[PDB]
Design an enzyme around this catalytic site. Structure first.
Site, PDB file in Angstrom:
ATOM      1  CD  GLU A  75       2.932  -3.007  -7.101  1.00  0.00           C
ATOM      2  OE1 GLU A  75       2.307  -1.807  -7.330  1.00  0.00           O
ATOM      3  OE2 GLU A  75       3.943  -3.208  -6.988  1.00  0.00           O
ATOM      4  CG  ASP A 103      -0.985  -7.385 -11.718  1.00  0.00           C
ATOM      5  OD1 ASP A 103       0.032  -7.464 -11.914  1.00  0.00           O
ATOM      6  OD2 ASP A 103      -1.899  -6.703 -11.200  1.00  0.00           O
ATOM      7  CG  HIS A 161       5.446   2.383  -6.359  1.00  0.00           C
ATOM      8  ND1 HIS A 161       4.189   2.270  -6.069  1.00  0.00           N
ATOM      9  CD2 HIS A 161       5.912   1.120  -6.889  1.00  0.00           C
ATOM     10  CE1 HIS A 161       3.753   0.853  -6.544  1.00  0.00           C
ATOM     11  NE2 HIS A 161       4.908   0.256  -6.867  1.00  0.00           N
ATOM     12  CD  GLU A 162       8.815  -0.067  -8.906  1.00  0.00           C
ATOM     13  OE1 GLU A 162       9.249  -0.893  -8.240  1.00  0.00           O
ATOM     14  OE2 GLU A 162       7.643   0.093  -9.458  1.00  0.00           O
ATOM     15  CD  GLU A 206       0.995  12.306 -10.382  1.00  0.00           C
ATOM     16  OE1 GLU A 206       0.574  11.152 -10.198  1.00  0.00           O
ATOM     17  OE2 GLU A 206       1.688  12.961  -9.624  1.00  0.00           O
ATOM     18  CG  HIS A 251       0.513  -3.918 -10.256  1.00  0.00           C
ATOM     19  ND1 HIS A 251       0.888  -4.930 -10.840  1.00  0.00           N
ATOM     20  CD2 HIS A 251       1.317  -3.103 -10.286  1.00  0.00           C
ATOM     21  CE1 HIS A 251       2.438  -5.035 -10.745  1.00  0.00           C
ATOM     22  NE2 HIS A 251       2.579  -3.545 -10.318  1.00  0.00           N
ATOM     23  CE1 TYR A 256       4.530  -6.551  -5.913  1.00  0.00           C
ATOM     24  CE2 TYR A 256       4.859  -7.897  -8.254  1.00  0.00           C
ATOM     25  CZ  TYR A 256       4.669  -6.739  -7.565  1.00  0.00           C
ATOM     26  OH  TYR A 256       4.282  -5.475  -8.209  1.00  0.00           O
ATOM     27  CG  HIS A 304       8.265  -2.642  -4.645  1.00  0.00           C
ATOM     28  ND1 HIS A 304       7.114  -3.696  -4.027  1.00  0.00           N
ATOM     29  CD2 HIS A 304       7.800  -2.163  -5.588  1.00  0.00           C
ATOM     30  CE1 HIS A 304       6.272  -3.008  -4.669  1.00  0.00           C
ATOM     31  NE2 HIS A 304       6.507  -2.574  -5.963  1.00  0.00           N
ATOM     32  CD  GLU A 310       3.314  13.306  -6.205  1.00  0.00           C
ATOM     33  OE1 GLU A 310       3.519  12.236  -7.077  1.00  0.00           O
ATOM     34  OE2 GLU A 310       1.942  13.770  -6.494  1.00  0.00           O
ATOM     35  CD  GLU A 345      -5.492  10.418 -10.331  1.00  0.00           C
ATOM     36  OE1 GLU A 345      -4.968  10.268 -11.540  1.00  0.00           O
ATOM     37  OE2 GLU A 345      -6.663  10.498  -9.906  1.00  0.00           O
TER      38      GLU A 345
HETATM   39 CA   LIG Z   1      -0.692  12.488 -19.133  1.00  0.00          CA
HETATM   40 CA   LIG Z   2       1.355  11.391  -7.585  1.00  0.00          CA
HETATM   41 CA   LIG Z   3       1.892  15.093  -8.539  1.00  0.00          CA
HETATM   42 ZN   LIG Z   4       5.183  -1.697  -7.332  1.00  0.00          ZN
END
Ligand SMILES: [Ca+2]
Ligand SMILES: [Ca+2]
Ligand SMILES: [Ca+2]
Ligand SMILES: [Zn+2]
Ligand SMILES: [Ca+2]
EC number: 3.4.24.27
Length: 316
Positions: A166, A226, A142-143, A190, A231, A157, A146, A177, A187
């Protein structure tokens, strides 16, 4: 640092043992010479002065609990590099093999991770809301995404372009992932969020409303918090990306899913060829439709699914 490429071994945040590319010169440094112009991991030593010191270890073994966040920051940077290179033919975040730098142990009890314009920065979390943030491959990707956005579309942004910025990061963090293929899901965060509670996260792409985020344009946040809801409103675009990939019926609109690889191709092309700093949601829809058209043809299932997914979230 100048020295020879070596291979160390250690444990990540979640207790998993992995090999890491290091560099030897008196000490063993977290400097991976095998990808582009290097991946370099630094110790911020609980301070906020950046980058801190390039991580040095006496024996090339990284099993102390203090080592774990650096092990993961370094290793997952390498996974993310490999994803962009093998999947999108993109060499590092600038497309010209820029060095990837990350600092861990930033501040004390810092429940966040971020790209600061030049490098990655990970807090250790406070042990309750978060454990060390580099333990989550989706957070790392994710980061770093950016950084990719900053060098390509440059989406500002704030407001809608910010919510796109975002969403793009949630999308590619999720696709990284899946690419690494250890317990993948839709998600975000997590693996590092709330060690006391099973099955929760910061955000859901499959069901944004689970955590209070809009899943339809009619529910957009229009206030000032925000940065105008970057977000919060990303949920609308996350849900559309989820529908393009997986399919489903959302507020009575049916979407034929086309899978993760095509989702990734369509959104990467939109990102790098069509989006601009001020793009709003409706302009994202047009970019994604034009992207699917370039890749698959204007009469394709792929184009039709893109159109359906944006209809489903209220974006015309
Ligand atoms: Ca947890
Ligand atoms: Ca995930
Ligand atoms: Ca996962
Ligand atoms: Zn972000
Ligand atoms: Ca050691």
């Amino acid at each position: 640092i100048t020295g020879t490429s070596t291979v160390g071994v250690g444990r990540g945040v979640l207790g998993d043992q992995k090999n890491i590319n290091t560099t030897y010169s008196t000490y063993y440094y977290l400097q991976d010479n095998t990808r582009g112009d290097g991946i370099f991991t630094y110790d911020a030593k609980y301070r906020t002065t950046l980058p801190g010191s390039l991580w040095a270890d006496a024996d090339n073994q990284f099993f102390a609990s203090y080592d774990a966040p650096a092990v993961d920051a370094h290793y997952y940077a390498g996974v993310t590099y490999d994803y962009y290179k093998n999947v999108h033919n993109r060499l590092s975040y600038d497309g010209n093999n820029a060095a990837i730098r990350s600092s861990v142990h930033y501040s004390q009890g810092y429940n966040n991770a971020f790209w600061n314009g030049s490098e990655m920065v990970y807090g250790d979390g406070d042990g309750q809301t978060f454990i060390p943030l580099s333990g989550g491959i989706d957070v790392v990707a994710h980061e770093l995404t950016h950084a990719v956005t900053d060098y390509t579309a440059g989406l500002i942004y704030q407001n809608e372009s910010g919510a796109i910025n975002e969403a793009i990061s949630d999308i590619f963090g999720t696709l990284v992932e899946f690419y690494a293929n250890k317990n993948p899901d839709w998600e975000i965060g997590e693996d590092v969020y709330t060690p006391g509670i099973s099955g929760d996260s910061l955000r859901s792409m499959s069901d944004p409303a689970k955590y209070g985020d809009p899943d339809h344009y009619s529910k957009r946040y229009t206030g000032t918090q925000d940065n105008g809801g970057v977000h919060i409103n990303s949920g609308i675009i996350n849900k559309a990306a989820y529908l393009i990939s997986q399919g489903g019926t959302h507020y009575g609109v049916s979407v034929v899913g086309i899978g993760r690889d095509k989702l990734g191709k369509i959104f990467y092309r939109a990102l790098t060829q069509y989006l601009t700093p001020t793009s709003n949601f409706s302009q994202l829809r047009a970019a994604a439709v034009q992207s699917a058209t370039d890749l698959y043809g204007s009469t394709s299932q792929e184009v039709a699914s893109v159109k359906q997914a944006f209809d489903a979230v209220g974006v015309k």
